[PDB]
Symmetry: D2
Subunit: 257 residues, 4 copies
């Protein structure tokens, strides 16, 4: 008797990192999960590793579709097709969007007009395209939810990441606009702090151990966030039929020191 059992959850960005943990958490509650990513080989491994963790579950409750949401001529159709597949002959109950490139941007001296606009494709256009088309594949009711992702660097930005912190503030304001545009559907944002995903190990390279320590030190929990803890923020937003227009911040007290 779990409230998320019959429910269909679409995770855009669920092939690795935080979004992948949300797929795992939703499956533990008995949900039907649809996963979206651009990497065909990450997509394939994601689905296999979830079936290994949940062998009881029907494989037809774990479906995956490949979309490159960074291409303007394709974002809109790939969003619509992923909404169609997540719905089946029913409607989607919850959508989660963690998808992002997370590659270090250029410094200020090399800043080009395309390096600013290119991230807005996946971070801004794709979520607005989800809102444009979700009414045909979702019921606009308070039991259904759309959740976007932001970060603590919206408020305490990292050096050289001003453009991405800008886009994190855009997602937060945007979610409030969508909570009105799509009312009574619920729209919220999760703002995570330092989460040790495999993408963050790639950006940091050989500076990974010096940045982890620092992160650890500049937090009240004295820890980095595990994807399985941050994933509970997304589950909470699916279960609280009264949460809309909010930011759920999970950052280990990082904003207090």
């Amino acid at each position: 008797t779990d409230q998320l059992h019959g429910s269909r959850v679409l995770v855009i960005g669920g092939t690795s990192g935080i979004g992948f943990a949300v797929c795992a958490a939703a499956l533990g509650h008995g949900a039907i999960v649809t996963i979206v990513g651009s990497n065909a080989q990450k997509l394939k491994d994601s689905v296999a590793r979830l079936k290994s963790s949940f062998p009881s579950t029907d494989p037809d409750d774990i479906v995956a579709v490949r979309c490159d949401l960074s291409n303007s001529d394709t974002v809109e159709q790939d969003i619509e097709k992923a909404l169609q597949l997540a719905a089946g002959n029913s409607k989607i109950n919850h959508i989660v969007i963690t998808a992002a490139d997370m590659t270090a941007p250029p410094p200020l001296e090399d800043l080009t007009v395309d390096s600013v606009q290119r991230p807005g494709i996946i971070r801004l256009v794709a979520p607005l395209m989800v809102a444009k088309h979700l009414p045909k594949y979702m019921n606009k009711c308070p039991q259904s939810s759309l959740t976007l992702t932001s970060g603590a660097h919206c408020l305490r930005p990292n050096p050289g990441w001003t453009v991405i912190s800008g886009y994190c503030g855009a997602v937060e304001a945007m979610s409030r606009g969508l909570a009105i545009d799509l009312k009574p559907l619920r729209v919220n944002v999760v703002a995570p702090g330092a989460v040790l995903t495999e993408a963050v190990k790639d950006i940091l390279g050989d500076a990974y151990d010096a940045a982890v320590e620092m992160a650890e030190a500049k937090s009240t929990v004295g820890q980095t966030g595990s994807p399985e803890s941050v994933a509970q923020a997304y589950i909470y937003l699916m279960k609280d039929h009264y949460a809309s227009g909010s930011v759920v911040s999970t950052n280990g007290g990082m904003l207090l020191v």
Copy 2:
């Protein structure tokens, strides 16, 4: 394997409304719950309704204590007594504080020095006495949590409830200080919107019908919040081992209209 199965949960203010729903939710995860309130027979009726809804659980896992937390002479000893009792032969894992007087304040013209300071006994002293004494009954680790209660009236005050909005802002700011003082234990706040508890009908009396309608209209969801929905925010904070220093706002989008 649920992290809240063996866990000891102290709900200060769990005899009615939001706190009671938090006990039901915690028991649903199999937790051991200790309840605190001032009304001796609200105590035995609350406990009886949870044992009847969860006959699976041993009856010695639902315990209640009576405390008057509005009385400065006794606040500290009754807090220490409730903490000793909820810990048992073990330590406390999570504490939730929803306790509040819930009596209509005077309008500003008839403001008296006592009407300002008396609400601070249950709203400020009682949580600080918990923080003062919990290290002897709790492990200061990120797996443990203390959660206080705030409200949307901190940002959209309700005329003339300026004094109560003041204390909600104090609770939010005090929780951030406690996240520093009690680290690496986690301290957070839940800020509910309009929750139709049986207490709010007493405060409103015959103007309840009209208020409800206004509250449903000032929201994206077109409804008031159920206590069992808002209770999921408290459950989320117990399970997200990375959340500290944060505010979980569940208000139905009322801050957006």
Copy 3:
């Protein structure tokens, strides 16, 4: 064309530090200023320092009265006395409240019920007593303003000042309620960061030099705040007839490092 020329401004806490700079700044615009403080000796030095710096100004446009606003028997009378004096045969145009005890609080193992409530007299009751009685001495119009004082430690608390952070959080929520209670009169808050007042050397004593340069190092400006500069935040709120319900944070980027 200066609109603070004919202006009557009451600065509660204007004998030293930030409040004193607001009196100096207001006098520079030619306003009539009334000062409130507890120290008798300090009051007559305050006015002597302003009359020498503004000798053209009629010395009767600089008045001071002594009140003990930490004092429950007298807070309301003293407030009514100061409002009556600043109004004269006219009305007060702007009120600024910087008054605070500025005494180091106890650590949390010796927290007393009185150490929680005793700061609340000057920080919460006195401004609420100003709001109660100001309608008889002010025109409730958008050209008039009430400005309270908070701090950046409301969001980044300083250990162990959790209680003082609580009251700063209360002042921020109280201002918003009073912006509604006293509409269309304007109510706002200034939240300063690190300002080297002579009181701050008293609190820290011999630890002053290790904290200053640590305050200077953990700021974007790399400097501590001058009472000159933060005083301009109060002047701004007096001149902007559209600012109400807001917090002016002047903190040198300290929430950014």
Copy 4:
């Protein structure tokens, strides 16, 4: 003997509305002002109306440049040209950015990938291009400032304006990143509420008299905002050498009802 005398102020977007009122305020303090807009006839009207209001002023203290910053081909080059002219034989002291198209966006039903990305050139790319090049034309010191513009719809979105609310959230978060990147130069944001500029009268058309009554009614001041009033927030940020990373919200208390 005024702190803005002789000071060089660059106002990007100063031909109409809020920015023009900032130009007027600055000239009253004796600053040297450079005005930027795209409309050649608005620029020549700007300067003529400021010279008539300040005939004492040297005409060489009022300089104007025409730039279309909505086009990626020239935005960076034209920004550099505007910085070079505002610096002259000296360095720029303060930069203010109000520039934006202020044209109603399409409804969500017709949302196109280009309607989303196009406002980001003037709203995001141009400020980042200013930050990229201002160090050769400004001293990075706490007495100099860069101020951007946001809005109250970032927190209370206006229906159908979700995309613009996103960009205002991006500007608030980007200013914080720039307060870090440009340190110790000061970066802040002004977030205005409802200001009846001639651009707003254009969007509303025949709905102007019904929208003003709605704006005046959902405010504590019972008024729309004056451009003259809102401009004092920008002047304040130029004079407070301790303000950095902050948002000055001037909205008439609209976030409170």
